[PDB]
UniProtKB/Swiss-Prot annotation, chains A, B:
Chain positions covered by the region annotation Dimerization of protease: 1-5, 49-55, 88-99
Protein name: Protease
Organism annotation: Human immunodeficiency virus type 1 group M subtype B (isolate BH5)
Function, in words: Aspartyl protease that mediates proteolytic cleavages of Gag and Gag-Pol polyproteins during or shortly after the release of the virion from the plasma membrane. Cleavages take place as an ordered, step-wise cascade to yield mature proteins. This process is called maturation. Displays maximal activity during the budding process just prior to particle release from the cell. Also cleaves Nef and Vif, probably concomitantly with viral structural proteins on maturation of virus particles. Hydrolyzes host EIF4GI and PABP1 in order to shut off the capped cellular mRNA translation.
Boundaries of every Peptidase A2 domain copy: 20-89
Active site: residue positions: 25
Assembly, per entry: Homodimer, whose active site consists of two apposed aspartic acid residues.
Length: 99, 99
């Protein structure tokens, strides 16, 4: 689709067997999701933004379906106020910013 | 342009006659820039980022060029890790996300 930016660009994702709403975020390097369980190995990580840093768990090689488009990559899990799809997965679905 | 997301979508902005680097950020409701002098009055605003809430200074009706496109709108000034162009100004320059 072509998504305007009058409102937040929220889409439905499927991750870990769960449907969630997430923000398509060109300003986020990395995908970050609210607390949930995911399978496999993980390691701790700190990510920072406005407000400072938060501690997250880094899970690699996780499959996500974003608005119907499958992708695989790293997913960070932790206390984010909103689920965010960052560039690491936006590239995989062919997302571009156009003007 | 059509900007892919393999690297951060950084552009040049011009504000107050000065060139700066900023990130095109679909996950930001609002444009937030690092400490600088802007004309006129300001109003208080709280914004909530990934690490919590921060106070910023809200300046309205500021002339700003974004990758060569003219915009006039609200600019927040405060402790951000990078200058961010949010949806309030991305809409002014006609940006959409496409996949
Ligand atoms: C500040 C950016 C350089 C980085 N961020 C992405 C950014 O899009 C966040 C994404 C975001 C969105 C909502 C809540 C928290 C974080 N937006 C944000 O902080 O925007 C603020 C300015 O406008 C307001 O509207 C939204 C919050 C305010 S971030 O959330 O801190 C972040 C940092 C690292 C990763 N991997 C993922 C996300
Ligand atoms: Cl990845
Ligand atoms: Cl590509
Ligand atoms: Na894994």
């Amino acid at each position: 689709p072509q998504i305007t930016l009058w409102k937040r660009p929220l889409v439905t994702i499927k991750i870990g067997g769960q449907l969630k709403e997430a923000l398509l975020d060109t300003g986020a390097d990395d995908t970050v999701i609210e607390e949930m369980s995911l399978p496999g190995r993980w390691k701790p990580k700190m990510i920072g933004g406005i407000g400072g840093f938060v501690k997250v768990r880094q899970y690699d090689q996780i499959i996500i379906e974003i608005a119907g488009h499958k992708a695989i990559g790293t997913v960070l899990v932790g206390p984010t106020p909103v689920n965010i799809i960052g560039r690491n997965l936006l590239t995989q679905i062919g997302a571009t910013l156009n003007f």
